[PDB]
Amino acid sequence: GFSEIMRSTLEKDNTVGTDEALLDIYRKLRPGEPPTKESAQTLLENLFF
Amino acid sequence: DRVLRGSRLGAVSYETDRNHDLAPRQIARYRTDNGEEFEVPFADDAEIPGTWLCRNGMEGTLIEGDLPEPKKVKPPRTHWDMLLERRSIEELEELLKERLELIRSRRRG
Amino acid sequence: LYRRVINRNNRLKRLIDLGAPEIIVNNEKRMLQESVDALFDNGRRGRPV
Amino acid sequence: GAMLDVNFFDELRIGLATAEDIRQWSYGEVKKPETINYRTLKPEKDGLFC
Amino acid sequence: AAPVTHIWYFKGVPSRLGYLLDLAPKDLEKIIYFAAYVITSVDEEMRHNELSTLEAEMAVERKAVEDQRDGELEARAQKLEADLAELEAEGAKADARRKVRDGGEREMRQIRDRAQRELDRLEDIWSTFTKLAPKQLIVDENLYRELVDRYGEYFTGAMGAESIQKLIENFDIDAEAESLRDVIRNGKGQKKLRAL
Amino acid sequence: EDESEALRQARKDAELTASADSVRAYLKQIGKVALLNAEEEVELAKRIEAGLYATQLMTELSERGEKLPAAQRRDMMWICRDGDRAKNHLLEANLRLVVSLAKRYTGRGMAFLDLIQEGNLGLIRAVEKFDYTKGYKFSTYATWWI
C-alpha cells in the first residue's frame, strides 16, 4: 500500500485472472508448447519449488 | 608417458625423379553415361577393363564398342517380394476382390 | 564432420531410392543441411556439434 | 594458372566457386564413411582416405 | 543427393542471400531448414481465368456451407422444441426449465462458431490464393496442404535449399539492379538505406 | 477454460515458433498425426497388400496384356494409390514409437537425430515385412526391426 512503484505496476499489469497470467508466463518462457493450463500451473511450482 | 612420435601409414623411398625413359603406356578413353569422357593412362601389357570408376563417380564404359555384357545381378528384394514370400495367389486375389467390392460400395454404394 | 555428412547424404539417397513419406525425407534433408553447416562453421547456427 | 606454384605470381583472384568448378577440381567422388581398415591399417576403397 | 545452402552466405550479418532475394533472415532460416514453404513461382493467366471461375466455385462452396450451418440451426431449433416439450409441458423447475434452453443456445453458438471458423479459414485461403505471389512464405502446414490440393496449378511451391536454388534461378540481377538504382535515385529515408 | 479464445490463440501463436532446436522441430512435426489401434492397422495392412497386388497385376497387364477398361483401370489405380497413402499413414503414425526406442540408445557415439532416422528406416523395413494375419499388434513386430 505504501509502495508507489508497485502500485503503478499494479494498475499497469494489463492482465487479470491468475491462469490468464500463468499462460502469459508459460508463453514467454516456453514458446512452442500449448497452454494446457495445468501444465502451466505445475511448471511455476516445478521451476522454483 | 611416450615421446609423441607420430608417423602416418606411408612409406618414403627417395629415388631420383628420372624422366628420360619410363614404362610405355597406352591411354583408355572411358565414357560415362552422361556424355562425359575421361582418360586413364594404362600400360601396354595391361588388360584394359570395359568399365571404370572415373572422377565423375559414375561407371564410365570404354568408348570403343566392345560391350562385354556383364549381365548384372538381380534386383535385391522388393516389397512385392516381401508380400509374396508370405502370402498366396488366391489370397491376394481375394483381397483384391474384397477391396474392389469396397470401391463398389464406396463409389456406387 | 566429413563422416557425418557422408552418412547423412548416403542415408538420404537411400531414402529417396526407397520411397519415403515427406516427414522422414524432410527431416533427413534438414539433418544434411545442418551437417554441412557444422562442417563449414561449427557453432555458428545454434548448438555447436 | 599454377598447379605446383613456381614463384612467379601477380594476383590471387578469389572467387565464389560453382558446382561445376568443384566437380572439376576433384579427383573422385568419395562415397563411403570408412576411414581406415580396422585390421590392416590401410586406406579403404572409396573411403575418406582412398 | 539434394542441394544445400552455404552457411556463410546465409548466417553472417548482413545475410547476403537475404539481401539478394530481399528476404528477412527469419524467413530465410524458416525456409532453409524446412520449417516453412515458399511460393517459388506463380501463374497469371490461369490465375485470373480460374480466379473468376473459382470465385464462383468458392461462392458455391460457401453457399453449401451455409446450407449446412442453417441445417444445424434447424436441428438445434428442433432440439430446442424438444427442450420446450420437456421443460414447459411437465412439472419442471423455474430456472432448470430455462437452463436447458440456455444450454441449447450455447450449443448453437459454438456450432455456428465452428462453422464460422471454417468459413473464415476458407475465406483466408481464398484471400491467400488471390494474393499469391513469388517469394512469399507460407507457414501453417495445413493451410499449405489445402492450398496445394485445391489449386495445385497456377503456382509452384517448394521448401528448403532446392527452392532457394529455384529462386536464384528465376531472378534477374539486372531487373533488381535497375529497380534499386531507381529507388536510390528517387527514394529516401529507410527505404534508401535498405535499398543501398 | 477450453473454449477461451486467448488460450487457443496462444496455442496458434505457439505453433508459429522458430524452434532452432531441430530435434524439437522434428518432434513438433511428428506430434501432429494421432495414433492408431488394431482395427486401423488391420485395415491399413489390407490396403497396403491390396494396392501392392493391384500395382503388380497392373504391371503384369502393362506388358502385352488386356486393354483395360477406363473404369476398371481407374478403380484399380485408385486402389494402388490408396495403398501407398495408407502406407505413408502407417509410417507417420508409428514414428513416435521409433522415437521412444531411440531415446534410450543415445549418448554413445551417434547423435540423437541420426538414431531417430535410422530407426525410421528400420520402421520402413518392418512395415514392409509385417503380416497382419498373425493377429498381433504391429508394435510387437516392429520393435525387433527398429
UniProtKB/Swiss-Prot annotation, chain B:
Superkingdom, taxonomy of origin: Bacteria
Keywords: Transcription, Transcription regulation
Gene3D superfamilies, sorted: RNA polymerase-binding protein A (2.20.28.270)
GO biological process, one term: positive regulation of DNA-templated transcription
Example of a GO MF term: bacterial-type RNA polymerase core enzyme binding
Chain coiled-coil ranges: none
A Pfam family reported for this protein in Swiss-Prot or TrEMBL: RbpA
Record note on quaternary structure: Forms a complex with the RNAP catalytic core and with free principal sigma factors.
Family according to the record: Belongs to the RNA polymerase-binding protein RbpA family.
Role of this protein: Binds to RNA polymerase (RNAP), stimulating transcription from principal, but not alternative sigma factor promoters.
The name this protein goes by in its record: RNA polymerase-binding protein RbpA
Originating organism: Mycobacterium tuberculosis (strain CDC 1551 / Oshkosh)
From Swiss-Prot, chain D:
Top-level lineage group: Bacteria
Similarity comment: family membership: Belongs to the RNA polymerase beta' chain family.
Task performed by this protein: DNA-dependent RNA polymerase catalyzes the transcription of DNA into RNA using the four ribonucleoside triphosphates as substrates.
Assembly notes: The RNAP catalytic core consists of 2 alpha, 1 beta, 1 beta' and 1 omega subunit. When a sigma factor is associated with the core the holoenzyme is formed, which can initiate transcription.
Annotated protein name in UniProt: DNA-directed RNA polymerase subunit beta'
Included range, full protein: 1 to 48 of 1316
From Swiss-Prot, chain F:
The family this protein is said to belong to: Belongs to the sigma-70 factor family. RpoD/SigA subfamily.
Cell compartment(s), UniProt: Cytoplasm
Location of region: Sigma-70 factor domain-2: 90-146
Descriptive protein name: RNA polymerase sigma factor SigA
Annotated function: Sigma factors are initiation factors that promote the attachment of RNA polymerase to specific initiation sites and are then released. This sigma factor is the primary sigma factor during exponential growth.
Motif annotated as Interaction with polymerase core subunit RpoC, chain positions: 114-117
Free-text domain note: The sigma-70 factor domain-2 mediates sequence-specific interaction with the -10 element in promoter DNA, and plays an important role in melting the double-stranded DNA and the formation of the transcription bubble. The sigma-70 factor domain-2 mediates interaction with the RNA polymerase subunits RpoB and RpoC.
Shown chain mapped onto the complete sequence: 206 to 351 of 528
Subunit and partners: Interacts transiently with the RNA polymerase catalytic core formed by RpoA, RpoB, RpoC and RpoZ (2 alpha, 1 beta, 1 beta' and 1 omega subunit) to form the RNA polymerase holoenzyme that can initiate transcription.
Chain segments carrying region Sigma-70 factor domain-1: 20-54
